[PDB]
Amino acid sequence: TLEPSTSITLAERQQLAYDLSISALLGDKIYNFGELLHHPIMETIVNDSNYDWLFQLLNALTVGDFDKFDSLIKVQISKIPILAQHESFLRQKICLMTLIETVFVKNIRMLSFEDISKATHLPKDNVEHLVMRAISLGLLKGSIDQVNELVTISWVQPRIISGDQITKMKDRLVEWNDQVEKLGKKMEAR
Amino acid sequence: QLPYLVANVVEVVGKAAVVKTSSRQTVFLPMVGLVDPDKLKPNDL
Amino acid sequence: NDKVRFIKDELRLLQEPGSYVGEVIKIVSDKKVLVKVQPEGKYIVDVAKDI
Amino acid sequence: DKTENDIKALQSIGQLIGEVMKELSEEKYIVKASSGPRYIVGVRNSVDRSKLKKGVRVTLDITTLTIMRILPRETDPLVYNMTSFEQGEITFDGIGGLTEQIRELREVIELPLKNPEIFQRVGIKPPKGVLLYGPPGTGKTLLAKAVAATIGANFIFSPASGIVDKYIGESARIIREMFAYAKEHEPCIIFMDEVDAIGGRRFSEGTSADREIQRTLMELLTQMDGFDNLGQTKIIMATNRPDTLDPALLRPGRLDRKVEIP
Amino acid sequence: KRIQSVPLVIGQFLEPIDQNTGIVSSTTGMSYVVRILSTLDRELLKPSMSVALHRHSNALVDILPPDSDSSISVMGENEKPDVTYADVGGLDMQKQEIREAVELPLVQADLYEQIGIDPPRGVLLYGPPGTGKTMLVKAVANSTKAAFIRVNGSEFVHKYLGEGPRMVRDVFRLARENAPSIIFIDEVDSIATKRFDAQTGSDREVQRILIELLTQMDGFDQSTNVKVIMATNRADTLDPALLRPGRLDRKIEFPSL
Amino acid sequence: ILDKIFYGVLDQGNGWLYVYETPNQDATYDSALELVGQLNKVVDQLFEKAS
Amino acid sequence: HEKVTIAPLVLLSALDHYERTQTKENKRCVGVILGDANSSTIRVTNSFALPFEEDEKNSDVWFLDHNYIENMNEMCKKINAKEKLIGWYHSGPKLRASDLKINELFKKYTQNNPLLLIVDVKQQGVGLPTDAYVAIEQEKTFLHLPCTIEAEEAEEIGVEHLLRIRLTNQLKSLKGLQSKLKDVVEYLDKVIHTILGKLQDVFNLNNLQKALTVKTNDELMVIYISNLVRSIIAFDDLIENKIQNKKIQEQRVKD
């Protein structure tokens, strides 16, 4: 709203930005903080030292280590219990979204339990609970078929990513066009 | 235009009346500001 | 070819405004006939040239 | 603007009324027009396709000849063969000193109308018919008007002689239509005054012109005893003295309640 | 196909004159000589039909089945019963009597054939209605999966010479097409009372109905795909003609003790 | 189970009661069986005439 | 959501307007559509042309007469009251900067929020050729509303006097895939993400059909059998007629 109109000064910007960072960290939705950093605040107001926390977070999800965000971040942020629970929801969300898009390029939506556990950097039984919890939220749709050690996955994950997506998308469109033509030739002929 | 066919009335929802014309036909028609629903009855022209 | 034609003959034949059933009251020698038509009036009408 | 809205309302075109004779299909219907001969007419758009029944009044297009609307069933005026008194002239505790008769009309008639559920739940029948007997104006008329007020029923006075048309099935038509209207406009009291111009025990129940009377009574008896029933249609008989009524009417399943007015 | 389309007028077929000519009556009160279907012939086509005619191309579009319902000279139809026997208790004897009279010839043709009898076309019930007596009748209609056709026998009692006596024939015809069916006659004893004396009009009709039923019953060889149930409350106001057997064989009593 | 009230079977070897599925054919045996009968009358007849 | 019924008359008048004015591709014919937009289903039942002169060299400069809309609406209304103003049409076929201004104007004296019907003058789509668009603002919002085509019983009958499979389907599928790819490449080219996401989802939700196809092959086997029997019934009839002919022929020659 702010950027075409909305008169502000750096005070009001700082207050608004500080609150934006805090809600984002504690939150778990609105994708990861890769999105937040991409929207403009870091070059309108100060870059680090309350704004260290976005970059640090991003790195803590990626390695897997809960201790690394906690040690780096300050008392105001660290204190909240909500954040650490929501860290797991975020870590699973990036690895699962990325992987899901990748694995087929025909739309076959399927992750094993093992594949997710490897990906997130977490033991099997812990991920078995996170995915169940996630279905519990409706952050994931599908169900987990406990026996055969395959996750049957249905859609609810929104995507907006690029740098994997574009590449995969051209291949899929090409592969179709070829498939269609061959069939189309044969029928046209007879 | 004079003349007009007369009618009797057998339904007086909010804008509807049914009139029975002296041509033995019943029609479903709407009402206007030149009728009152108080002059829509049997034994009136 | 015949089949095409058969269907067509039906399509023409079935288009009609209907003809009235009536009764000859009596025969007239100027080649008119008097018919009292069942649902219509009474008319004196011109017999067919070929009847 | 009112005059300009008026001209708009006038440019509209008539639209012929019929009755559905029977529904032939889900997209073909047989109609006896109330404007013409016999017709096959069809569905339009977004029409009620399972509610068109024998003798319901319907709206049909002038040229399109498809179902434009459904109206409630009507085949007889509602305004002179049926004279309507919405509520009652007086309440049911302002005529007080008829209190015993007030008391036992109140619990037979009011309670199944208001609460059909208690009679369904027990599994017994709701009451059928109620009889007022004694001279008229002993406060007879009061008690009949007064039970209707409290329910907020319509009181509907039917003159029994007028139920005596001399045409085929007119007589059938009139009774049925009151019963049909009683269910549409529910709750309602159908008050039938004198049951010796359409019922009674006659001269000996032979034929002298006592078959018109016999046709009328037969109709009353067939609906009551049969598959049809009285639930939110209450029928109330009135008679100078009760001994004058056919013993079929004196059976339960026609008249279960029989109140005296001393 | 595209031309032969709803909406159509209904009129009635009198007779086919020859092939592609039939005479029709439009229900306007105008009659026409028209061409007929070339989908049907004379072996696919019966003479008396309700028919569909084109409105402006006045010709045989389609055939309908015969129809009899109208708002003049009314008849009661009740389709899909909902009553099943032993509504009232102590009709043990009576439940068995009706069962072998009415229910049995319709479901099993075959037992009448082998004994070498022909099935009774009529049953008489005497007693009060609406005690337990009506309830059983309605129960048979349900069990046989038959249309219940309620006739108030004083309803023609129409005051015209014309429409009603004609209708009654048509009702029974419509019943045979949609076999099985119950023609259930309220107070047949009303119209078992007839003129004996000069009374002119307004007493003439009860003779017409009585005679109509009589012509049919005695005039035709026995069958039962349609049962006639007579219901009676005055047992002396009958006429002997009715009561004669070879047609009306069953006399079922409703018990009063 | 043998009367086929309930659609189960017994696995006696196992000593357990095991599942069965109630619908084991569609209406194509009936349908064809009727057709075979008609066709066979018509054909048989026709061959005789041809001679 | 709203949905559009467009009468043939609108489209054929639009056609006539384009041709008689020798409209180019630096000009677009502009007119008025009329009907009823009273209901949530918008019925377009008539239309009429407007004097309009366009300059697409300088987008701002165009010449359109309002007064002609107003004077004609009163005359239109006097004949029937269902010829009320619901919108406008232009050819388009693409959206321009001079589209932006005209969208503003019609908002003011249309009682409803006008329908902008884009009438394609070459028929470049495939099946159908007409797209309905709507302007409304908070960000300029243009959203394709579905169309469908209907006419009166007498018109429909009229249409047909004037005028008097598997491949085409494969072909719509082939064209679509091609075009969508073309749009995706260009979209990327301009860029160097949200849209890519939107497309990606549609995709994600022969491959799929695959497993279920197996029991459709059982269903098809049954139909093979029915059909076998139907050819055989015709063959039976062919035999009868051939016997009859044969015998009759022998008799003719003999006599």
Added chain:
Amino acid sequence: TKETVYISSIALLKMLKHGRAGVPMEVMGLMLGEFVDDYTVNVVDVFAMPQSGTGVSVEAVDDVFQAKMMDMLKQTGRDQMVVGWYHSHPGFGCWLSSVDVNTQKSFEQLNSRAVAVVVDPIQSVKGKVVIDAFRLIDTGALINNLLNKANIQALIHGLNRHYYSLNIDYHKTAKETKMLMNLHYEEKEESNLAATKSMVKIAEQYSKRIEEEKELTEEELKTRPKKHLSETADETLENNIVSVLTA
């Protein structure tokens, strides 16, 4: 006598639409176009005039209305003369009213010649369209195509009456016609949707065709029918075949 009066598609469409809602009260409007030599009347456009609630009349024509529409038409670039008039008139299609004859006589003197187009909307729903075109009086083919000259010799001696039933044709332009046929997303959706819904329902349809066959086969046996069996075998077969073909 003989004239091919050429009706534009748009004129036709707008006349049938208007005329069907406009009845039972008569409706009229003006036909626009050109005369080209003789043997040819081209009608280019048609516009409505107002309704009147008891039927349009010669007393109801209004020259200011007809005028204000043409002047506004002109600045699109629609420049035509009046070539005639249309009227609804139920139960007219081969006959004319005495009012309508007199009405035509005033109109054709203003123009060079003029058609009275009478459209009937009742038998326009019966799988046919009824329209006729008349012109009694004038020179244009009553002297090129017309005992011998019998109509116009008697015509001029007066105390005569003949309708002047004309010939009529249609066409507008090719481009409109390609567009009209492109009315019938589209063909693909439609075809898939039908395909799925066929597979669901084949369960009833199987059984029902067995009865049709069975009935036919029984009939034949008694007889020997064959014609019905052929029709009835073709219809079922063609329709399988499309259901199979889709998949």
